[PDB]
Amino acid sequence: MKQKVHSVSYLAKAEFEYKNGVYDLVALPTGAEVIKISLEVVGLPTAGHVSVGFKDESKKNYSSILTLPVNETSGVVTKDYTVKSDKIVAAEVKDALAEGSDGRPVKCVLRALYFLPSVIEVEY
Amino acid sequence: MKQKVHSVSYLAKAEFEYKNGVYDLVALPTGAEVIKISLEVVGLPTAGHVSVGFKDESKKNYSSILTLPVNETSGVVTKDYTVKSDKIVAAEVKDALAEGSDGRPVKCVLRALYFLPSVIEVEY
Amino acid sequence: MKQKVHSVSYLAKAEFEYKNGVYDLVALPTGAEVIKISLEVVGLPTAGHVSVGFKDESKKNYSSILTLPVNETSGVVTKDYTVKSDKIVAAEVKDALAEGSDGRPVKCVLRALYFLPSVIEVEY
Amino acid sequence: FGNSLRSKIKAYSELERIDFIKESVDSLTTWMNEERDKRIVASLTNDFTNYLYNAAMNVATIRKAIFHARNGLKADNSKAFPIKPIRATMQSVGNVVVQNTSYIILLDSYQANQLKADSEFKELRKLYAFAGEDKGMLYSGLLGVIDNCPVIDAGVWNKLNVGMPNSSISDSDFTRYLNKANVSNIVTPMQLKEKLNQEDISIGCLIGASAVLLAGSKETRFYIDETVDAGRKSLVGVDCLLGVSKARYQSTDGVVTPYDNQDYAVIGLVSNME
Amino acid sequence: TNYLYNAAMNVATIRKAIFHARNGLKADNSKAFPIKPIRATMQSVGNVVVQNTSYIILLDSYQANQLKADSEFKELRKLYAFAGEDKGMLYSGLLGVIDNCPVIDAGVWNKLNVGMPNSSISDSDFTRYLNKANVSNIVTPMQLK
Amino acid sequence: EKLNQENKDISIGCLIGASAVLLAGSKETRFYIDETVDAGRKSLVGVDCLLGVSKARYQSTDGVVTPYDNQDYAVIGLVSNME
Amino acid sequence: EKLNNINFNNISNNPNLGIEVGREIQNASWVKSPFFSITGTGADRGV
Amino acid sequence: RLFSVASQQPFRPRIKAQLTGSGVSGNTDFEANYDNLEILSQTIYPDA
Amino acid sequence: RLFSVASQQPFRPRIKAQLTGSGVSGNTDFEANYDNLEILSQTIYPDA
């Protein structure tokens, strides 16, 4: 029994304030082993969607991987990802107005747990 | 592309024996990045609920975040948490009698994967 | 507040080509804290199941823990595991023919995130 | 307890011309000094057995506090026991010795100003000037002594430096500095303000001999780890272990005395600051 | 960024400024940070040893006159005289110290000699001595008025 | 794309002259040997370089206009197709 | 394309002028609490 | 304060702030809570 | 071109435009036609 495993893991946490726009949340290296993406809505939104996905450092390669309507206020991507030139995790809010029902601004927190491309050899 | 990430991660595993009471399972530091809480029931319970949640080191600030009835015997919190003075993960069993249907005592295992508040700067 | 936690974590990624057989994907040490098993199907299968489970290094102790039909193409185990002599994560495909609908062979990727049995003492 | 800093890569460290070891050691010395002082202060101003409360400090309340300490009285005259002085000299006024006693008074800066902008304090300073007793205190802006007890402006508790606490310190940021093994009960300035609010504040103390007990080493250890990231980075850490506790002296047997759950040599002095 | 305005220079305002410097409060008594002193020494109050801070407070000569005509300043000078503190200041016309901080009569800014500015200094004249590469914004005395 | 507007793949060469590009920063790459990994069982060898590479292209220090201004100092492009 | 008008620029924006950063970083901490004077090993010390 | 600078270039004095960080307690490894050293600077330009 | 500079600071390569002004002739003094020393600059930042 012998294998190569990723021994280095990072967590990136980034906040944005949940109104229309595009935000570049997490930067990933080539060969990164993205194993968890979680999005959370802190507050009480009244209308809008948040779409998180992957895009290039420069060019317009955005593609949503997780969509969150107002109601559930939390989500996790159902899929695991190896970074292949799509080195930006990004989130866009197309519909949103002011906070709503609270008076206090609505937050969105994205946490990305990913393993670095480096590998080491271990036998058990 | 440059950011700050959490580079230190711990897993805490704690067992309790699934009968009425309150147990302080996992201790977390301020600023900890709790990214996974999982609860497991080893055995065949006959009646009761397990509620895991957060509470203070001292004062009575308990609030359930995951409730488990008898049937499913496993659960994971759907939400991610930054520790803000609620530095105890705790679990309470309000209804439970002896093991039931087995003769062997029923176990509950809680695993908490969390990232330490420390950050480092990385550019990709 | 003082505890012992697992401070060492590895990720093992292994690919197989999705046709009938048994594959030994991930090797785990005794006392390993398996906290995530994820299986992914890269391509468009037409018929078949993939069953991932645990088995011994030598003897025939295979038992499926996650079954994936053709349609959903991705899955994650709902349960957390402490390695007790079942030190092989294995995957078997009982039904599968050639790629189907694509002309390009169908891949399956398994990622196993597990914490090493070592513990350290920390107080917060 | 301890703290540490990890550097940038040596290329970056010598690019921005920072000598990481030297600056880090200095900053960590400052951090550790402030941390041990905050330990002492947090243990000192933890749950108060007897505390006086005047809406503004004045020589009236200082005299009342030195009074209650000298003869052992509580706020409601529960008559606990006399606080041992820092120094207890003995001098005869006409032909009779009286054993004058000296204490210490740590005042918040807002409290120090409330005392400064206090009439009776002004006439007291005037009288000291006439007699030439506290010479050097009006020149220096200090608070001199009152009833043989030095009155000290300790400061204000904040993120930047240590000083006497106040009700704006959050509960968590106060309990960080309590051992929780040396304290039986936690009463933070938030909690104390809620307590005396049943019938923002700022805390000061009257201190007798052995008001706070330190056990262990006062020395500090530094750890320099040049071998981080193969050597591109270094990690500088600072650590000390020290047991701080406000003297409380529970008991040995089950016998009840006036000393049991009583601060041995501390009287609280609460006053509004704003 | 931090300035106190009083209709006249009394000892109350001088000591308030010393307090804000020592403890670090803004002009709206909000917390900024303790100003570093010109000197910081150790003085024994009884057996205790505390740290005292000496700043330098530079007064426009109009303000020096306003302070000499301050009742509280006269009380403080009387007390200094009784205690035998800094002597030959009223005799020699100076302003002594206040809360360990020397009070200086700087002068008046005119075409001839240099002193603390007035609201009478022209904006052009005042800016002439500003680098404008070493400033974030320009607030001349007329603008401050 | 710029050539297309004014689908074939292109290949890029250049005529270069003196001081076409500028290598600011030392030539001394640094090597880090850490024989302390795994309590000293393993070694790690890293190489690090601070390097400023810039194609020579100067700017006017004042408002005067110059032929050299905002132009590649000593480089002329030469673009063909890939065939 | 206006030529030789008034500049209105500081001594900055002069690329011939290079910036130097100070080796000596000055600590922004100066306050010293009195507790060291209180603390002692004698039985009659406040701490 | 005088900042005599050889070559009389523009200067950039720097200060470092307080370390306002809760450290690590007990056996917890230093690295579980790293502190951050923040530096502040300003630029002085000459005038003739 | 290699620009080895101590302290590895961001460098400032710097060139002069060639003098393309007609000078003076005969008895005409220099100040009747001063030539302009025109300087051009570039900044090279490092990459780690």
The two three-digit tokens of residue D45, written as one number: 């101003």
Residue D131 is classified by DSSP as: H
Contact residues, D window 31-90, toward H, CB-based 8 Å cutoff: 31, 34-35
- Which residue, among B85, B87, B118, B123, would best test binding to D if mutated, counting the most D CBs under 10 Å from its CB? B85
- What's the gap in Å between the CA of D224 and the closest CA on chain I? 25
**What gap in Å lies between CA A109 and CA I15, rounded to an integer?**
50
Question: Which technique?
Answer: cryo-EM
Residues 6+ apart with CB under 8 A from G6: none
Q: Does the distance separating the beta carbons of D17 and I7 come in below 8 Å?
A: yes
Q: What is the resolution of this structure in A?
A: 3.0
**What gap in Å lies between CA D270 and CA D48, rounded to an integer?**
10
At E39, which amino acid appears?
R
Beta-bridge partners for F2: none
- Torsion angle of C-alpha atoms E33, E35, E41, E44, degrees rounded to 10: -50
At H13, which amino acid appears?
P
Nearest C-alpha neighbor of D13 from the set D226, D166, D155: D226
**Chains contacting C (3 or more CB pairs within 8 Å):** A, B, H
Residue G26 is classified by DSSP as: E
At B83, which amino acid appears?
V
CA distances from D128 to D134, E82, F24 (A): 6, 9, 71
**What gap in Å lies between CA B86 and CA B32, rounded to an integer?**
10
Q: Does the distance separating the beta carbons of H19 and D31 come in below 8 Å?
A: yes
Q: Does the distance separating the beta carbons of I8 and D14 come in below 8 Å?
A: yes
**What gap in Å lies between CA I8 and CA D129, rounded to an integer?**
63
Q: Please count the CA atoms within 13 angstroms of the CA of B102 that sit on its side-chain side.
A: 13
Phi, psi of E64 (to 5 degrees): -65, -40
Beta-bridge partners for C74: C40
The two three-digit tokens of residue D88, written as one number: 């207890």
Beta-bridge partners for I41: F59, I14
Nearest C-alpha neighbor of D11 from the set B2, I45, B6: I45
Phi, psi of E82 (to 5 degrees): -60, -45
**What gap in Å lies between CA D80 and CA D187, rounded to an integer?**
20
Straight-line distance from the first to the last Cα atom of chain E, in angstroms, rounded to the nearest whole number = 15
At D264, which amino acid appears?
Y
- What's the gap in Å between the CA of B29 and the closest CA on chain H? 9
Q: Closest to C80 (Cβ–Cβ): which among B14, B30, B40?
A: B40
**What does chain A come to in residues?**
124
User: For the purposes of burial, counting CB atoms within 10 Å of the CB of E33, is it exposed (0-12), middle (13-18) or buried (19 or more)?
Assistant: middle
**What gap in Å lies between CA A120 and CA E66, rounded to an integer?**
78
Distance of CA D21 to the CA centre of its chain: 32
Q: Closest to D9 (Cβ–Cβ): which among I7, I8, I48?
A: I48
Residues 6+ apart with CB under 8 A from A60: none
Contact pairs from chain E to chain H, CB under 8 Å: 7
**Residues D142, D153: contact at Cβ < 8 Å?**
yes
Q: SS3 letters for D81-113?
A: CCCCCCEECCCECCCCECCCEECEEEEEHHHHH
- What's the gap in Å between the CA of H27 and the closest CA on chain C? 5
From A118, which residue of chain C is nearest by alpha-carbon distance?
C11
SS3 state at I33: helix
Q: Does the distance separating the beta carbons of A27 and B123 come in below 8 Å?
A: yes
- The beta-carbon contacts of C74-79 under 8 Å, at least 24 apart in sequence, are C74/A78, C74/A79, C74/A80, C74/C38, C74/C39, C74/C40, C74/C41, C75/C38, C75/C39, C76/A78, C76/C36, C76/C37, C76/C38, C76/C39, C77/C36, C77/C37, C77/C38, C77/C52, C78/B74, C78/B76, C79/B40, C79/B74
Question: What is the C-alpha radius of gyration for chain C, rounded to an integer number of angstroms?
Answer: 16
**What gap in Å lies between CA G14 and CA E55, rounded to an integer?**
38
Contact residues, F window 19-48, toward D, CB-based 8 Å cutoff: 30, 32-34, 36, 44-46, 48
Residues of chain H with Cβ-Cβ distance to D237 below 8 Å are 30
CA distances from D145 to D72, D133, D171, D203, D269 (A): 21, 10, 33, 19, 17
**Residues F51, F28: contact at Cβ < 8 Å?**
no
Extract the runs of DSSP E, i.e. beta strands, from chain F: 10-16, 21-24, 30-37, 42-48, 52-55, 59-60, 75-81
Residue B78 is classified by DSSP as: S
Bridge pairing between strands C88-93 and C50-55: antiparallel
**Residues D130, D226: contact at Cβ < 8 Å?**
no
**What gap in Å lies between CA E82 and CA D125, rounded to an integer?**
11
- What's the gap in Å between the CA of E17 and the closest CA on chain G? 17
Phi, psi of E17 (to 5 degrees): -65, -40
Q: Please count the CA atoms within 13 angstroms of the CA of F8 that sit on its side-chain side.
A: 8
Using a CB–CB cutoff of 8 Å, tell me whether C107 touches chain A. no
Q: Dihedral sign, CA of D72, D75, D78, D80?
A: negative
Q: Does the distance separating the beta carbons of H35 and D3 come in below 8 Å?
A: yes
Q: Does the distance separating the beta carbons of B116 and H32 come in below 8 Å?
A: yes
- What's the gap in Å between the CA of F7 and the closest CA on chain I? 34
**What gap in Å lies between CA E33 and CA B42, rounded to an integer?**
57
**What gap in Å lies between CA F62 and CA E63, rounded to an integer?**
47
**What gap in Å lies between CA B34 and CA B115, rounded to an integer?**
6
- Which residue, among I5, I9, I11, would best test binding to G if mutated, counting the most G CBs under 10 Å from its CB? I9
**Residues I42, F54: contact at Cβ < 8 Å?**
yes
Residues 6+ apart with CB under 8 A from A67: A49, A50, A51
CA distances from D48 to C14, D187, D205 (A): 62, 8, 10
- Which residue, among F57, F58, F61, would best test binding to G if mutated, counting the most G CBs under 10 Å from its CB? F61
Residues of chain H with Cβ-Cβ distance to C118 below 8 Å are none
Q: Does the distance separating the beta carbons of H7 and G26 come in below 8 Å?
A: no
Q: Does the distance separating the beta carbons of E79 and D125 come in below 8 Å?
A: yes
SS3 state at H7: coil
Do chains G and I touch, with touching meaning 3 or more CB–CB pairs less than 8 Å apart? yes
Q: Dihedral sign, CA of A13, A14, A20, A23?
A: negative
**What gap in Å lies between CA A90 and CA A111, rounded to an integer?**
12
Q: Does the distance separating the beta carbons of G7 and F61 come in below 8 Å?
A: no
**Residues A110, A29: contact at Cβ < 8 Å?**
no
Q: Please count the CA atoms within 13 angstroms of the CA of E99 that sit on its side-chain side.
A: 20
What would you measure as the largest C-alpha separation in chain A, in angstroms? 58
**Residues D144, D137: contact at Cβ < 8 Å?**
yes
**What gap in Å lies between CA E92 and CA A100, rounded to an integer?**
69
Residue I35 is classified by DSSP as: P
**Residues C2, C114: contact at Cβ < 8 Å?**
no
**What gap in Å lies between CA B77 and CA B50, rounded to an integer?**
13
Distance of CA F19 to the CA centre of its chain: 12
Residue with tokens 């519909």: A95
Q: SS3 letters for chain A?
A: CEEEEECCEEEEEEEECCCCEEEEEEECCCCCEEEEEEEEEECCCCCCCEEEEEECCCCCCCEEEEEECCCCCEEECCCCEECCCCCEEEEEECCCCCCCCCCCCCEEEEEEEEECCCCEEEEC
- What's the gap in Å between the CA of G4 and the closest CA on chain I? 14
Using a CB–CB cutoff of 8 Å, tell me whether C8 touches chain B. no
Residue D166 is classified by DSSP as: B
**Chains contacting E (3 or more CB pairs within 8 Å):** D, G, H
Residue with tokens 């920390």: C122
**What gap in Å lies between CA E88 and CA E75, rounded to an integer?**
16
Residue with tokens 């709503």: A100
Nearest C-alpha neighbor of B93 from the set B58, B46, B59: B46
- What's the gap in Å between the CA of B64 and the closest CA on chain A? 17
- What's the gap in Å between the CA of H37 and the closest CA on chain E? 17
Distance of CA E27 to the CA centre of its chain: 14
Using a CB–CB cutoff of 8 Å, tell me whether F61 touches chain G. yes
Contact pairs from chain D to chain F, CB under 8 Å: 23
